[PDB]
Amino acid sequence: EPVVVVRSEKEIVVLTRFEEYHFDLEKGILKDFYTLVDGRKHVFTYGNDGFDVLDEGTPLTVIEEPIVTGVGKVSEGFSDEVSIVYNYGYVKKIFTIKNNENYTFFVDIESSKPVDVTVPRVSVDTSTDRYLENYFASFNPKTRTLVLLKHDEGLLFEGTLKVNGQKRFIVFMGPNKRTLIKKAFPEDYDVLIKALVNIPGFNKWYDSVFYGLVWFFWWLKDLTKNFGWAIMLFTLIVRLILYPLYHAQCLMLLIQLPIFMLLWSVIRYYVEEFAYSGSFLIWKDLSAGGFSNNWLFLVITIVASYYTIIMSVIFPFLFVGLPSGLFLYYATNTLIQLAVTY
Secondary structure, X not given: OOEEEEEOOOEXXXXXXXXXXXXXXXXXXXXXXXXXXOOOEEEEEOOXXXXXXXXXXXXXXXXXXXXXXXXXXXXXXXXXXXXXXXXXXXXXXXXXXXXXXXXXXXXXXXXXXXXXXXXXXXXXXXXXXXXXXOOEEEEEOOOOEEEEEEOOOOOOOOOOEEEEEXXXXXXXXXXXXXXXXXXXXXXXXXXHHHHHHOOOOOOOOOOOOOOOXXXXXXXXXXXXXXXXXXXXXXXXXXXXXXXXXXXXXXXXXXXXXXXXXXXXXXXXXXXXXXXXXXXXXXXXXXXXXOOHHHHHHHHHHHHHHHOOOOHHHHHHHHHHOOOHHHHHHHHXXXXXXXXXXX
16 A cells, blocks of 8 residues: 555656556656556557657757655655656656556646647547547547546647646546546536547447446445445345345346346446545455455355355355455345345
């Protein structure tokens, strides 16, 4: 739970849990970007994308070694934010990366003369690029990476950032996740989404169906309890809706697999702050890695037989290999069964 700074001979690397940034030593460019959320995924490489500071066809080299500063001084990287300051001598550029697990960083730029700053494109063609009102969007369907750069030039944006005086730019660079876009741009989220939804491959059978699932979950996640105690309430609306099937009850096992397959891929899924910057609930992290939650749920499957043994062997292999979300789902299933008959 710190931002680790690794420095090599060709580059400076800033590593957070889900974000991996490589910055150069010469032009002040982001060389490469990897999202580490599921595996190490290479979602960006420099074409000339890297926030080069241009005096109009003329790239600039720094006049001194970059300075690293930040919040907290752990002798292994920082604690809250990290700043890599680059000095080109009439242009100063500062990259600030705060540990929000939002995939979001800040390029703070100060110039005495109008200069051009190149902008990162993750896309393949310009069909997945947009120059929307007060934002530049670039999306790669393959890696599902969204670049949102708030340039505040809106409708006048020419393809490179013009910088005269001081300017701050907020760059969302990471996966395309609607939960994260709102924290990044709360004020403009609504007008942004209408324009981004139109980009080829931004949705795909995920409109009023899946964010209807994270509709139920995000509307109930705040501020019904913490993250764990609000998983059980979803199990209760599945119980209210499906108990008329199970009170008048074969299908018992089948139709639960849709919701098991769906709540499992929903936990995270667009919910990676469900385990970082989020919270402990009871004894867990919540995105497991099973535990005595699902082992006392082993005994809980034994106590459903004992209530009003073999199935408790089938449980561990699945639920110690699966997140606590599913161990808490399964546990809560049988505990509203014993409360039904006794």
